[PDB]
């Protein structure tokens, strides 16, 4: 089990969208992970060892217990049977209580496809008769993180104390952000802007197709 | 302070909209209230005398720390200075951490006016220089409960353990029972919304702002 | 011709979404049907004979003239050429004046795919040069019924006198609802809740991408 | 009773928005009317004398059973008790089964106010205890017709056979002809919306509630 | 005429919302102004004397051709005839080709009222028969600037070269600095929205109508 | 480079959606083009020469510098690797500053698929490591034109002086509009209706997922 798993199209994308929240969950004692669907080979600069080192350093900064990769083709993500079944099999193994996956609305077709894959795989992982190994597992909560298209957030997660971890894990991708340095500062401004609506220094936006079960007097 | 106050246009409306959530807050040990803006004269198909007993019975069922009325005219709620100022004064007196007010979209213009009134009053209550008595107070959270029009909820509050209190408090208005099929339908709303999220009953609310949520937190 | 055809991803799903309206159309003398795209084999419990018997009993309760199945793979519905063409061929044969198909917004990828299949097949069935047998046929009205995601209905159909048929045809799937019993009572509450907005005991919601041609003084 | 009443802010507005539908209702044998809330003084680029003839000509073309005016101030429509109460009184006098009122979203604040007025008046007219004369009456259906702002229609009414009456009734306002290109554009609206649904012309309306529709019924 | 006028509920609000765009207009040689509807008495945590200097400093930074105030009551903005008519009169005096006004959706009821006021006043100012002095004037474009509530922008104005003027003009309100983190957040808004469109900073606006755009034109 | 390229599912569809704007851009001295994804063979009447002649005449009327076809199957458009890569390769060759592609919301599945293809191809064309020939090229602006589903336009383009060219290029498809004559007059009424909201005789609606960079005082 993971308390929280982020499914990302390639390495750096889970960090970009969810780093603050992942760092917070770790601080609160949760076991966290990122599953990357591809190795980002159509956008990566650097040797296998160099890209691997950035992932290890980002994972360290955020305090992930789990980091894995499905090795699907970069630029070839698609909601097709083979990818659906392999993600669903990973979900039964990982048993995540909460999953974050990319929001469908995006300029990058891999994000849209990851989004659809997570939906279909969550459903499949839960089916008694799905052609998969192991016990059926039903993800309790699936939320989506925005990428490069505007969105109307369903909720935000306060991450004020975790902003420097968010930023350091993204900047760990030195071959990528040294989206670039301007991309990073834009996503930091997103967090500052959204958080200020709710009276906090920084917050990370998420979308849910369902209204959340919220306790209106609970702490931020 | 109250931990939670429901502002309602006429008695029975706060219960109708938020009774399950009010009962849950009370069970969790919070201080709760309903402030009614009118006495509901233009609809009270009971006497003023018996209506008084209904309100007390409903308040007891929900375990309200506070029940009050501002005495504005039924059918005449409006976002005008007089009403804004008396509501802002009450908010300063009650110091509610969270307020629920009716959703603007409705067939009943009092609901719509109560909505606007709550917004404007929350604002005025927090202004140092406002023409009001006491210290300025800033309501932390303002959320809206749907009435008789469709809505897209921002969040739901799980109330499965409190559905019977919600229903008993509404039914406390014996003289009222828009209502017998009305109550049925509002219980069906709670069953319907709650099932999306895998719970027996839940009450829907709307926020103009995304809520600050902790996605691994308990329901 | 059918006056009304419901296209469903698997048996029980057309009943769950449209049973009241189907029972009403029958009462009004229309010839009705359900076309199931798959046999529901990845979710079914029971022998071939047992599942077949539930379908026959549900069909009886609703008074369907037509019941058929395309035998596509359960969990494998997709808007791909082979499925598109086979549904389109069924539509030319059936000649439905009105078709109901699942709404795209759903946790179950088969519903979303059925939705897209119905759209594409309606278009194909209408084409002179489509590689299909028989006379081109243009479905006059295509509406969508909600599944398990929230929706904003375009219209409702009053079904107060048909609620017990709706419920009995769903409960005919004894291996399934004995979604479960709680699922059924939730969909019954949907109907009660939606109907009460419009002053009726029960009503079934539908979505149309087009505004409907409505007569504002006509009877409910 | 009327079967159908259009509430309009100034004369020509009801025709502009709903003339095809009014003519169809009449052809199907229904009793129809327009109630104008103002005389349109602040825009009447004709005389009050000639405007009277235009209104009568337009009413005749559409076959209205009832034409009236409430005499509220042009440019001063507002959802205030005085106006609410006089409109609610007229609704009780006319007992319309279906009312059409302007859509709220508009550049002209009278349209917006007429919208709110209709909502509040429908409500008041149905209240036993309202300060009004006669029996309480509950309008069955309230729908809204778009003005000069974009809208997402809830439904369309097929008016292909009635397009010429719609156009003749609008053109009846000779002194008016915002308008010559205005009329052209509103006829193009009807052509455009109607084509989505495979008909020559249709008039769009908005409902806050999904309509009770019979999906195999005739257009 | 002005080429561009920003109508703001209290001083600092026009700058907060539209300062980058105002500075750009000025750099391109347009005539610009801010008309404040109130003096912001109910919030001015400086003196009236020092507030006067702040407004002048902010106006100078942005290069405004016109700065004025209508003296309406802070916290009492309302879409009522008195206020409508005085605003419509000012629009006739200023003849602005483009007006910016606050977006309706807000926690502060003055923003909401200023929005409605601008709509109604634009309309009245253009009416031959309106009870106003001077020639009728028709504002060509009316757009809305967001305040403290979320919004979906219709368009953005690239202001990368003007971000420092925007910030200096807001900071000119020394006595004010809702604000220090407020300013930071509004600069972050501009960074965030601007990045969607590949520019350093941009200011968002809302139009109820699609804009007339030339899709190969320069930013 | 083209200043403006319209990507259309079949010949006549770019003209129907964008003709006015294309004619305007030409008048203003821009180099314009239409890339048709298919040859419209499942909807065309007439010989290869006849259909070819209509395209040449429409292209003439609008003043296109470029007219091309990718030869994908009519009724078989899909966001699949082969179609994605071939459109992306065409975009790198053409180097369009501004591209218009069909809006996703449509009854015709080819429009929806063209829409998704343009998005994915714009992304691919811009990638250093995409398996394509030639210099990476990043389309600056991608907008969408409505087809047969309602829409909420993001902007309109004033085309009052170009309405007769728009209409003549559509009517050049004599085998098609002699959608038919009624279809044409409906799209002309769309332009008249939308333009009147903004005080112009005719305007063509477009959608953008991003707010546009607009100069609020600029000329229409």
TrEMBL record, chains B, D, E:
List, in alphabetical order, the Gene Ontology terms for molecular function in this entry. deacetylase activity; hydrolase activity, acting on carbon-nitrogen (but not peptide) bonds, in linear amides
Record InterPro entries: Bacillithiol_biosynth_BshB1 (IPR023842), GlcNAc_PI_deacetylase-related (IPR003737), LmbE-like_dom_sf (IPR024078)
User: SUPFAM superfamilies annotated for this entry?
Assistant: LmbE-like
State the NCBIfam families in the record.
thiol_BshB1
Please report the name of this protein according to its UniProt entry: Bacillithiol biosynthesis deacetylase BshB1
Q: Which species?
A: Thermus thermophilus
Q: Which GO terms describe its biological process?
A: bacillithiol biosynthetic process
Taxonomic superkingdom: Bacteria
Report any Pfam family annotated for this entry.
PIG-L
Gene3D superfamilies recorded for this chain?
A: LmbE-like
């Amino acid at each position: 089990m993971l308390d929280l798993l982020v499914v990302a199209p390639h390495p750096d994308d889970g960090e970009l969208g969810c780093g603050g929240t992942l760092a917070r969950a770790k601080a609160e004692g949760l076991s966290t992970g990122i599953l990357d669907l591809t190795r980002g080979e159509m956008g990566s600069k650097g040797t296998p060892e160099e890209r691997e080192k950035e992932v290890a350093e980002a994972s360290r900064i955020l305090g992930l217990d789990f980091r894995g990769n499905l090795g699907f083709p970069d630029g070839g993500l698609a909601d097709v049977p083979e990818q659906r079944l392999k993600l669903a099999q990973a979900l039964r193994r990982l048993r995540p209580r909460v999953v974050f996956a990319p929001l469908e609305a995006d300029r990058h077709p891999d994000h849209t496809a990851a989004s659809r894959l997570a939906v279909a795989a969550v459903h499949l992982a839960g089916l008694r008769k799905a052609p998969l190994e192991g016990e059926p597992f039903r993800v309790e909560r699936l939320f989506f993180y925005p990428g490069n298209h505007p969105f109307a957030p369903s909720f935000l997660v306060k991450i004020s104390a975790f902003i420097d971890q968010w930023e350091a894990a993204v900047l760990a991708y030195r071959s990528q952000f040294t989206v670039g340095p301007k991309g990073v500062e834009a996503r930091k401004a997103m967090r500052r802007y959204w958080g200020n609506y709710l009276g906090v220094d920084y917050a990370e936006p998420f979308v849910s197709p369902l209204p959340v079960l919220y306790v209106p007097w609970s702490r931020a």
